[model samples]
Target: SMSVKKPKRDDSKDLALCSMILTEMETHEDAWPFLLPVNLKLVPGYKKVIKKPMDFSTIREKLSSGQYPNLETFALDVRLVFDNCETFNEDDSDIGRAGHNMRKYFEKKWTDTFK
Candidate 1:
């Protein structure tokens, strides 16, 4: 008989962040809030990629600071999240593309809402 090792259980911080991100995505119908958090767990090699527990500080900063200079930069940041999530694995290219598309969708919505 073959035996397989069970994966370690993730801490509550991971679960809370994941849940919050999922809720935000569902409620807003926007992927931006949840993108990083989702990637933090769903992407392969998550622990190797994430040096620390998922923190909402960066997200809060981006929202409150109004520091994003333009849509392009914001899109790139989302891509960065995807990249980190994948840890540069070739299999995760789709995740990166998905993040890009999500950014585009959110940017369009943001523009439309303001206009």
Candidate 2:
């Protein structure tokens, strides 16, 4: 079967940017928590509290599969990772600290690359 076409305008450039940032985020020291889905066995209440679990692996899949409509949507998902982190973790905790650090790093990269 032929590949599914993108629903909107071409966003190859934006996708490239996303992929680049994804690589950087993967290598970031603070990326561990967001790297994969939280283990329910380790954190039993996570599913009950977090309605939408977002992670770098999922984001990478979306990117590789060409599921994101544009840069904005991709940014939204990236932000969601940090937002969920804040919701699930205390600011004084390591995971929460990582979320804040990663969020700041992403924002800086986003702006530096685009503006």
lDDT of each: 0.47, 0.92
- Residue-level lDDT tens digits of model 1 in 1-115: 2687678554434333433443443354434344335454575666675564332345445634666554444444544554453454354465445455554654565455333
Model 2, position 48: C-alpha lDDT score: 92
Backbone clash pairs in model 2 (N, Cα, C under 3 Å; residues 3+ apart or in different chains), count: 0
- In order of appearance, the predictions have TM-scores of 0.33, 0.87
State in Å the error of residue 78, model 2.
Answer: 0.4
Stretches of model 1 off by over 4 angstroms after superposition:
1-57, 88-115
Cα RMSD to the true fold for all candidates: 18.2, 5.8
- Candidate 2, residues 1-115: lDDT per residue as tens digits? 3787657765558878889998999999889999998987789789999999999999999999979988999999999999999998999999989999999999999999877
Worst 10-residue lDDT window for candidate 2 reads 4-13
